[PDB]
Design a protein around this ligand. Structure first.
Ligand SMILES: [Br-]
Lengths: 20, 138
């Protein structure tokens, strides 16, 4: 797995806040 | 200054950030205002910005706690804007290495701030700049 993904994830981790 | 005492100071601040976050989240779970991070952010940010403590704070995993303070509350609301602005400014000053980012995952919450449409223009800009900084560096 790429370093960028280790650090920033997929960029969807907190998207549930918006959908709230 | 004794490096054992520095380490004590760092671990003390880490526990203090942990305890404040826990109490805030428990209040939120119980439907009560969270006030602890708000009450303490300016003093705690001053300590997080102590040049003599920064290597040690980062060594002691302080990005875990910063990340927690930035994360949504149990009700899915975001912490008070005073915390959002101030901790982004703190993070900007820290000499954060690739490894610190990997282990803490603070990059994930900061990236969310950078793309959150409901965030203030100023905080979103700061979060974008931190993402860019941490990319530039890595
Ligand atoms: Br808060």
């Amino acid at each position: 797995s790429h370093m960028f993904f280790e650090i920033f994830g997929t960029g969807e981790e907190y998207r549930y806040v918006l959908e709230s | 200054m004794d490096p054992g005492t520095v380490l004590e100071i760092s671990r003390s601040l880490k526990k203090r950030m942990q305890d404040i976050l826990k109490k805030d989240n428990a209040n939120n779970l119980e439907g009560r205002p969270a006030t602890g991070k708000i009450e303490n952010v300016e003093e705690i940010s001053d300590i997080l910005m102590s040049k003599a403590l920064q290597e040690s704070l980062l060594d002691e995993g302080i990005l875990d706690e910063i990340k927690g303070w930035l994360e949504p509350l149990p009700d899915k609301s975001m912490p008070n804007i005073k915390i959002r602005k101030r901790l982004l400014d703190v993070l900007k000053t820290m000499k954060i290495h690739k490894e610190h980012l990997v282990t803490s995952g603070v990059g994930k919450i900061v990236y969310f701030y950078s793309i959150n449409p409901k965030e203030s223009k100023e905080v979103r800009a700061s979060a974008k700049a931190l993402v860019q900084k941490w990319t530039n560096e890595v």
